[PDB]
Amino acid sequence: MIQKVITVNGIEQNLFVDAEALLSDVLRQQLGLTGVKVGCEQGQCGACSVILDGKVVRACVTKMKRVADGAQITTIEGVGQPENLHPLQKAWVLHGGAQCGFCSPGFIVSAKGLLDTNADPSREDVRDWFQKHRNACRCTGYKPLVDAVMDAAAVINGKKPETDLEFKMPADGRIWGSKYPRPTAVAKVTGTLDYGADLGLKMPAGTLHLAMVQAKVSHANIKGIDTSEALTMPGVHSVITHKDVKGKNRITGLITFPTNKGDGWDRPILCDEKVFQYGDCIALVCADSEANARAAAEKVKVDLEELPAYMSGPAAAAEDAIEIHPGTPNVYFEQPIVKGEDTGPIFASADVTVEGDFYVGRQPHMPIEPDVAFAYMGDDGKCYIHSKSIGVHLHLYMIAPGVGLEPDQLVLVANPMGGTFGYKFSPTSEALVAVAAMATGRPVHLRYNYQQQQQYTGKRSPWEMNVKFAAKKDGTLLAMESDWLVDHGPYSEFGDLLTLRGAQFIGAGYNIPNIRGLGRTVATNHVWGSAFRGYGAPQSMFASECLMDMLAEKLGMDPLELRYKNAYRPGDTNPTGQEPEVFSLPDMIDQLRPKYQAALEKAQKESTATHKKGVGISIGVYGSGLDGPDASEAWAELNADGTITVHTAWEDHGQGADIGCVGTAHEALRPMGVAPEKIKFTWPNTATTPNSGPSGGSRQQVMTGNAIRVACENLLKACEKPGGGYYTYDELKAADKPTKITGNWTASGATHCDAVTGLGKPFVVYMYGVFMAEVTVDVATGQTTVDGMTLMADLGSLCNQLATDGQIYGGLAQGIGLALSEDFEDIKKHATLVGAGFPFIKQIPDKLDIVYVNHPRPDGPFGASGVGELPLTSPHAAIINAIKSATGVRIYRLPAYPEKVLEALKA
Ligand code: FES
Ligand code: FES
Numbered sequence: 064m065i066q067k068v069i070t071v072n073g074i075e076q077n078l079f080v081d082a083e084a085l086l087s088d089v090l091r092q093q094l095g096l097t098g099v100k101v102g103c104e105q106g107q108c109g110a111c112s113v114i115l116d117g118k119v120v121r122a123c124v125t126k127m128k129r130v131a132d133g134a135q136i137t138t139i140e141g142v143g144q145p146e147n148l149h150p151l152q153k154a155w156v157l158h159g160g161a162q163c164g165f166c167s168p169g170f171i172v173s174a175k176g177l178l179d180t181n182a183d184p185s186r187e188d189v190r191d192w193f194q195k196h197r198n199a200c201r202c203t204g205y206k207p208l209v210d211a212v213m214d215a216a217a218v219i220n221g222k223k224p225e226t227d228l229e230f231k232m233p234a235d236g237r238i239w240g241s242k243y244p245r246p247t248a249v250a251k252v253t254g255t256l257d258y259g260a261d262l263g264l265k266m267p268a269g270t271l272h273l274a275m276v277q278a279k280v281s282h283a284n285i286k287g288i289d290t291s292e293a294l295t296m297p298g299v300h301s302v303i304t305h306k307d308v309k310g311k312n313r314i315t316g317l318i319t320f321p322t323n324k325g326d327g328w329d330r331p332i333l334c335d336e337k338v339f340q341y342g343d344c345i346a347l348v349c350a351d352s353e354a355n356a357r358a359a360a361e362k363v364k365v366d367l368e369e370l371p372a373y374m375s376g377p378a379a380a381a382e383d384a385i386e387i388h389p390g391t392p393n394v395y396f397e398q399p400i401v402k403g404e405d406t407g408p409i410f411a412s413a414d415v416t417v418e419g420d421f422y423v424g425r426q427p428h429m430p431i432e433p434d435v436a437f438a439y440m441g442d443d444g445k446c447y448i449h450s451k452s453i454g455v456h457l458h459l460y461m462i463a464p465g466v467g468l469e470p471d472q473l474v475l476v477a478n479p480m481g482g483t484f485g486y487k488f489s490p491t492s493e494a495l496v497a498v499a500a501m502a503t504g505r506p507v508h509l510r511y512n513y514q515q516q517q518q519y520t521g522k523r524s525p526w527e528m529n530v531k532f533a534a535k536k537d538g539t540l541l542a543m544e545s546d547w548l549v550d551h552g553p554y555s556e557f558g559d560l561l562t563l564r565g566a567q568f569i570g571a572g573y574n575i576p577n578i579r580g581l582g583r584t585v586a587t588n589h590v591w592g593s594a595f596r597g598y599g600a601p602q603s604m605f606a607s608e609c610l611m612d613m614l615a616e617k618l619g620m621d622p623l624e625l626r627y628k629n630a631y632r633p634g635d636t637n638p639t640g641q642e643p644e645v646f647s648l649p650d651m652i653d654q655l656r657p658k659y660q661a662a663l664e665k666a667q668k669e670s671t672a673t674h675k676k677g678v679g680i681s682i683g684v685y686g687s688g689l690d691g692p693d694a695s696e697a698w699a700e701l702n703a704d705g706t707i708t709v710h711t712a713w714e715d716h717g718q719g720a721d722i723g724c725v726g727t728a729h730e731a732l733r734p735m736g737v738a739p740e741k742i743k744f745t746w747p748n749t750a751t752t753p754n755s756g757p758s759g760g761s762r763q764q765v766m767t768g769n770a771i772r773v774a775c776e777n778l779l780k781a782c783e784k785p786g787g788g789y790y791t792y793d794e795l796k797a798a799d800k801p802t803k804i805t806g807n808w809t810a811s812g813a814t815h816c817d818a819v820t821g822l823g824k825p826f827v828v829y830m831y832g833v834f835m836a837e838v839t840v841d842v843a844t845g846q847t848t849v850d851g852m853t854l855m856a857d858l859g860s861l862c863n864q865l866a867t868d869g870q871i872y873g874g875l876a877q878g879i880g881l882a883l884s885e886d887f888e889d890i891k892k893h894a895t896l897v898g899a900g901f902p903f904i905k906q907i908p909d910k911l912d913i914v915y916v917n918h919p920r921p922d923g924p925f926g927a928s929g930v931g932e933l934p935l936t937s938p939h940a941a942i943i944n945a946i947k948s949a950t951g952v953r954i955y956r957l958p959a960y961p962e963k964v965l966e967a968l969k970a
């Protein structure tokens with residue numbers, strides 16, 4: 064141990080530390096500075112950026128011996144606090160740079176290091192700096208962050224007044240459609256919002272820290288577990304196995320389809336008889352600390368009979384394949400799509416047919432914050448779970464029978480979270496912490512490290528796809544055929560539904576009167592499938608949007624013009640036989656056309672012999688809602704102090720659940736003249752908030768937004784004074800009148816897609832968009848650089864521009880990763896941010912362009928559709944179409960690795 068007298072945030076600290084200790088650990092645990100956020104723990108993400116003697120370092124790979132006596136450290140807490148914001152923190156808030164906010168402290172600290180050395184940086188300087196210092200963001204696509212640096216810089220330089228960093232009201236009082244900052248912005252940019260790991264450091268002693276004992280093979284029969292050595296190890300309380308589980312020890316898929324050949328109880332909470340994938344939790348060590356738990360977990364011995372593993376869809380779908388779940392065939396679900404006439408004869412007689420085999424792989428969500436949960440037995444005897452669940456009511460019913468509790472005896476609460484991008488549509492650690500809390504009686508806490516986040520949370524499921532188009536010489540689509548195989552890993556949850564998405568979205572965007580297709584779901588021993596932003600669209604529309612460009616090339620037609628010809632117009636139906644609710648695609652194409660022609664011209668002019676430039680186009684379509692007559696509930700309550708709380712279980716991945724609530728409520732409350740700062744939101748809690756539903760399927764703004772609008776409309780009626788005006792709280796209570804008002808809303812006109820034909824009206828609101836990608840391909844290396852992305856977006860009406868801009872920028876960046884760099888195929892290699900091809904700032908162009916072409920939705924609140932998954936429907940198709948336009952080569956199987964591109968280039 065050594066004494067180090069240093070300065071931390073301007074205050075002299077008398078530090079007593081292990082020289083080998085990590086600065087991140089010291090700052091967070093010993094000094095309580097949880098504003099230093101830790102994600103990857105491997106120096107790759109920059110979340111832990113601190114300033115050490117004028118240099119930006121990553122505290123997670125800075126050992127205390129590198130901290131000299133009298134050193135000066137600045138963390139986010141020293142940059143500024145809620146009542147004393149730094150220009151960089153004000154700028155972040157104004158520009159909407161905090162979405163999930165997990166990266167915000169590191170980014171702001173890093174940016175402060177930048178401005179202290181380069182006071183008046185260019186946009187490229189900013190990007191260069193964030194690249195060098197490895198500041199990663201998964202939410203924003205970087206543009207708003209650079210916007211914020213530039214604006215703060217102007218203020219610090221004395222070029223602009225600081226008051227210009229404060230939000231200005233639109234001068235009618237309308238925050239709907241505005242750039243009003245999200246309520247959580249201040250806490251995020253000051254590091255005063257407590258995420259799961261932060262809460263764990265602030266829990267009382269007696270809290271047990273968990274570590275997972277995980278399978279180190281992909282497929283096995285378990286013979287026994289030996290905990291003897293682990294129990295003698297330092298800090299160890301006990302080891303939990305399947306024997307300690309009070310219920311079925313199974314997670315249920317809950318809405319398993321009838322034609323599913325599996326019962327949907329295939330997933331264990333703790334492995335009993337079998338290992339189904341690498342990483343499966345077999346046991347939980349409970350100890351006094353994470354470090355001690357992890358140490359002992361290494362010594363728990365599992366006796367395994369290793370079985371052959373099927374590591375892809377095709378391998379597991381073979382006739383001769385051994386059943387992974389005995390009694391259930393590996394191909395456990397099939398969804399046909401049968402629309403209009405038989406396609407066989409139409410394909411035979413058409414002027415032009417095209418066909419293609421396409422692949423989209425196991426994309427890893429890669430949130431900066433790795434999975435974390437905790438649980439405890441309350442004084443009331445209920446079991447409470449606090450996690451990253453983005454569907455608390457959903458997960459309750461998925462886990463309750465497994466852990467052995469009645470629905471009334473378990474409570475699920477969503478912590479503030481650093482992004483999920485769909486992986487939290489699945490339970491990850493909830494049942495594990497419940498089981499541990501129940502068996503021990505003590506508070507338990509479980510934090511995954513980044514490797515576990517990669518290997519042992521759900522992934523986008525790979526699809527092997529064959530799609531075909533039949534068409535007239537004028538470009539009129541006549542028919543389509545489709546076959547898709549979905550590799551869902553060993554756990555069935557929502558696998559059949561994902562498969563159904565192929566029926567709804569392969570070929571979405573165009574009038575296609577005749578379709579014959581078949582989707583198949585298959586269990587494998589690769590990572591289990593959890594929703595990933597887009598959920599079926601990125602796979603489906605990659606195939607159909609690439610094939611649209613192939614059809615265009617065969618016709619001798621401009622790809623944009625071919626789309627203009629076939630795009631939804633009044634009278635047309637989508638693939639499930641349903642009429643579009645608005646018709647905005649022709650409008651969006653027309654407005655993009657000149658930008659597209661201008662991009663083509665630039666591409667040809669600026670191309671060289673070694674660096675070829677191209678332009679690609681795609682369309683994107685997705686539903687807003689869960690399938691069928693989806694519904695939400697909200698409560699509007701006037702409180703004693705004259706504020707209004709809107710109670711919902713609108714789960715915040717980071718997308719802006721808080722601003723969606725406040726924005727929608729304010730618009731609905733306008734007649735009563737309610738200031739936005741007086742409107743409160745609620746963190747999701749199964750006991751104290753209504754079943755608003757999960758934050759999945761880009762549904763909340765529509766479903767819960769409507770429910771909030773109805774609740775607020777009903778509160779107005781309850782507050783309405785006879786003869787005009789409104790009662791106060793005190794007046795209402797004195798009259799013994801209610802002050803907490805319910806509102807519900809239902810997508811009444813929706814129906815589920817039929818099990819035989821795939822036809823129906825699954826969503827009443829869809830999202831529509833047109834993508835344009837501009838790329839440069841280096842033909843010597845096969846390396847693609849995306850120079851610009853454009854999205855024409857119809858969102859009906861914007862609740863909040865900061866939120867929708869950020870959403871789109873974020874999804875476009877994930878499109879670049881999906882197209883060029885991202886995959887989880889090799890269990891070990893792809894277990895880091897860098898190894899799995901996470902897009903750092905230089906991989907994302909500064910040129911991200913949005914054009915809103917809003918066609919108000921009949922069923923949307925004030926006209927709004929969702930936005931969440933739109934920017935990820937097909938941006939990767941536009942990118943791949945752009946590579947083809949640049950070089951003549953088509954990548955059919957994502958991602959377009961440089962070597963892969965080179966191989967095609969030289970074929
Ligand atoms: S770089 Fe330190 S937590 Fe990622
Ligand atoms: S706001 Fe950057 S990771 Fe979420």
Ligand SMILES: [Cl-]
Nearest residue numbers: 523595598599
């Ligand atoms: Cl998916």
Ligand SMILES: [Cl-]
Nearest residue numbers: 953954955956
């Ligand atoms: Cl390929």
Ligand SMILES: [Cl-]
Nearest residue numbers: 960961962963
């Ligand atoms: Cl490569």
Ligand SMILES: [Mg+2]
Nearest residue numbers: 574632634635
């Ligand atoms: Mg027609």
Ligand SMILES: [Mg+2]
Nearest residue numbers: 962963965966
């Ligand atoms: Mg090669």
